[PDB]
Request: fold
Amino acid sequence: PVLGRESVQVPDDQDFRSFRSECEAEVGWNLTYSRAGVSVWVQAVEMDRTLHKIKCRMECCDVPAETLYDVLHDIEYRKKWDSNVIETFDIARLTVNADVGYYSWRCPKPLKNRDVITLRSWLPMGADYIIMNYSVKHPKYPPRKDLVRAVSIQTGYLIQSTGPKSCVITYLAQVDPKGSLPKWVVNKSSQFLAPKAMKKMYKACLKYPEWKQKHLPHFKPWLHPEQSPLPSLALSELSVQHADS
Reply:
């Protein structure tokens, strides 16, 4: 896997293909929920000892693919509609379509808050878009004693345009929150909350054009990479983040 046992890699063309193929694949996935255009699948292994990959698909009848793409890319907007995020920002750029970033979120009070450092890469494929990420180690961002460092084994989005003003988005993730949570508790929780998180994102897409008009509408560095204010990084300055060490 891109998430690797040997070293950090910027996703190549095959990694984008495997990811899309993973989203479109149904064999090896069991349906778990399906109501009002939102469905949730779980990787058909149902061995509750391990961490399961989760897949969530949502039909967006009245938002275009490009708007959903902006919303996934817009780090600044995340704090407007994401009720869990503490801190999120990009750290450095690797290539014109790959960077490294930081994301913190709060967990209910016996649990501690969590953070991730991820390598993210994005690719418009014709009418569709893919954004993927997986966890990585950045020497200036070691774990913090107050936060549990989680590991994103693989997380990403496939946006499929279904015409103007409409699209379908598939979210695929496998995230280990580490800490003290049993893996099967994570599998169940992420399954149970997934449809709610997707519909919150959908509502955000409806409010996005008006919000973005008030917040430098022309500033979209994910579409115009010459606008990026980020420093650059060599791939060898990063280290692999193992799910289990």
Q: What stands out?
A: The CA atoms of residues 15 and 21 lie 10 Å apart.
